[PDB]
């Protein structure tokens with residue numbers, strides 16, 4: 001199957017926000033450009049606070065239809081060359097959270113990383129999660145574009161909200177964003 005990428009704000013009005021260049025986001029392209037393994041601040045915005053027990057899942061899928069059923073995973077080189085938490089095959093890691101769970105779906109084999117949902121930090125109207133992408137889009141992904149899908153879920157895994165963004169993991173994020181944006185224009 002293929003995970004849904006349908007945007008769904010849900011009952012809590014859930015949606016994402018985003019902040020050399022380590023990571024840069026293009027609203028026009030709904031695309032995040034980032035360097036390998038670097039900190040990617042992704043913001044969780046809600047109109048109402050979900051209850052304790054709410055979880056936040058991040059999963060990558062291929063954007064292109066001809067590769068949608070394939071599991072996005074690290075290339076062999078990058079799986080070999082770690083915090084001891086993220087499985088070496090997982091593309092997406094969470095940085096700075098002592099409660100990240102790395103999961104593999106029993107039937108689809110897809111990877112995901114989940115952390116407990118936490119209300120906004122002081123001085124902020126959103127909750128920020130720091131993600132790291134462990135393989136380049138060019139490796140493997142081999143130039144195929146991917147989407148990161150973030151889902152807000154209850155403790156049993158039921159959907160509460162969904163949002164998503166394209167991601168390109170690359171050596172020069174700032175330059176590649178300009179290139180793709182100028183091309184859009």
Ligand SMILES: [Zn+2]
Nearest residue numbers: 075078135139
């Ligand atoms: Zn790689």
